[PDB]
């Protein structure tokens, strides 16, 4: 079949992709170096820096949340099982590290038919680690739109129209808003996200970001992981 030396053409990848509008996203699915960064200037303006958000106080409570995940502060919806019909390409999930979830039947069994059977699903249901699986996940809509689930994210309190829901490490804004409590996806801090192959695709405005080796702890254990920051 079609081969580009790897990372996305495996029996367990849901290749249910509709580029009827001819918006070139299939080139990105097939070449990791291909991204579409048009419209990134506008989109980034709506994303806010952490200082502009209200400070947080009291206990932290969990929250349930929109349409675009490009911002570090997007409040993901908690993960569930999604039908393979609605996914194009690989689905990446973040331990904090990048890990790939493949197509399965409704009972966790591995299925090898490129998400073509209607039984085929992506079971992305999450409990935060260490006693769990991953903090969040990110894939592509069958029509080329990035989709992120994760959490449940964090309410840190605060008052105003500037109040913040933390899906990352927000220790400045609240000392208990640490990734191990509040992480809900690939955003390690407000300024950094986990580096994986289809990151230029899923998050195309991180293209000028620089890659660093970063170090973090989850529940007192250490992960050394490459991530992109700017």
């Amino acid at each position, epitope marked *: 079949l079609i081969n580009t030396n790897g990372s996305w053409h495996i029996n367990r990848t849901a290749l249910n992709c509709n580029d009827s509008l001819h918006t070139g996203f299939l080139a990105a699915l097939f070449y990791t*170096h*291909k991204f579409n960064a048009s419209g990134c200037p506008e989109r980034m303006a709506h994303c806010r820096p952490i200082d502009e958000f209200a400070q947080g106080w009291g206990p932290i409570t969990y929250a349930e949340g929109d349409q675009r995940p490009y911002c570090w502060h997007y409040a993901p919806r908690q993960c569930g099982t999604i039908p393979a019909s609605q996914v194009c390409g690989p689905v990446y999930c973040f331990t904090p590290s990048p890990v790939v979830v493949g197509t399965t039947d409704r009972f966790g069994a591995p299925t090898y038919t490129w998400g073509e059977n209607e039984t085929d699903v992506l079971i992305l249901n999450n409990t935060r680690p260490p006693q769990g699986n991953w903090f969040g996940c990110t894939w592509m809509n069958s029509t080329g739109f990035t989709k992120t689930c994760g959490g449940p994210p964090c309410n840190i309190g605060g008052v105003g129209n500037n109040t913040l829901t933390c899906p990352t490490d927000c220790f400045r804004k609240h000392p208990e808003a640490t990734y191990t409590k509040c992480g809900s996806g690939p955003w390690l*801090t407000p300024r950094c996200l986990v580096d994986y192959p289809y990151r230029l695709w899923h998050y195309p405005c991180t293209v*000028n*970001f*620089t*890659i660093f080796k*970063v*170090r973090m702890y989850v529940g007192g254990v250490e992960h050394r992981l490459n991530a992109a*920051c700017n």
Partner: antibody
Framework: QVQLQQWGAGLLKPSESLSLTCVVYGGSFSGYYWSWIRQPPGKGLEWIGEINPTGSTNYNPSLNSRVTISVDRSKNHLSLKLSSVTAADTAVYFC???????????????????????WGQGTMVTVSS | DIHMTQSPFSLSASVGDRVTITCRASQSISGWLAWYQQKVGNAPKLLIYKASSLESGVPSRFSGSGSGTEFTLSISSLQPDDFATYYCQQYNSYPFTFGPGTKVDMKR
């Protein structure tokens, strides 16, 4: 994973221009620092220059502003251009990637990079009139 | 520009020898020194960065110590895989400059 496949050159003559490419296999070009280094034959290493993740370049003044480094994001390509070539410029040319800087998440600070961890096998440029 | 020198130019060793070679700098380069190995016809390999930190996949035989104007690379027990020309590089200032190399060869 990341590899550097380097593409060769032809015979050059002085006053000509040189253009050499290197294609990043194993991963994208993004987020990395890339540099060009040359070794005259029998001699040792000289740093031609660098490109930062957002396109900005730094060049060695010993090239007398006759050198250009670039990245073609459309084809995953790293290029080196050297105008007004002289027989002095006969050397092996290497593409290398900077070692990813260490980043402290809390301080949001890192050392700016200068070590080359992946190197392309290098390719000869002979320049004689 | 910062001038990098090395001693010795040529060292003749045998397996099991501890080899120590020094790099020196015209101006203080702090810790921003890297050490590379190059075997003939092949590309340079990174061994040390930050003058003490060892890049992954290179063995513990290789040690780096130094600061300011003087730095040093050492093999605790040379092995046949360790005969090459060894180079130092500052990344303190632009232009990034290299040392002229130290060749370690077989002893007979």
């Amino acid at each position: 994973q990341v590899q550097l496949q380097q593409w060769g050159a032809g015979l050059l003559k002085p006053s000509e221009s040189l253009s050499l490419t290197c294609v990043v296999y194993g991963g994208s070009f993004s987020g990395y620092y890339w540099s060009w280094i040359r070794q005259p034959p029998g001699k040792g290493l000289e740093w031609i220059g660098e490109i930062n993740p957002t396109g900005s370049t730094n060049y060695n003044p010993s090239l007398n502003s006759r050198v250009t480094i670039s990245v073609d994001r459309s084809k995953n390509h790293l290029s080196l251009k050297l105008s007004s070539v002289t027989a002095a410029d006969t050397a092996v040319y290497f593409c290398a990637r900077f070692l990813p800087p260490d980043y402290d998440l809390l301080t949001d600070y890192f050392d700016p990079p200068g070590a080359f961890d992946i190197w392309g096998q290098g390719t000869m440029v002979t320049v004689s009139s | 520009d910062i001038h990098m020198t090395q001693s010795p130019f040529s060292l003749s060793a045998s397996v099991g020898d501890r080899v120590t070679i020094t790099c020196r700098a015209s101006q203080s380069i702090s810790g921003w020194l890297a050490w590379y190995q190059q075997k003939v016809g092949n590309a340079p390999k990174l061994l040390i960065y930050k003058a003490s930190s060892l890049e992954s996949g290179v063995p513990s035989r290789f040690s780096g110590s130094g600061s300011g104007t003087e730095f040093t690379l050492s093999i605790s027990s040379l092995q046949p895989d360790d005969f090459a020309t060894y180079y130092c590089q500052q990344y303190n200032s632009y232009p990034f400059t290299f040392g002229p190399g130290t060749k370690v060869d077989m002893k007979r």
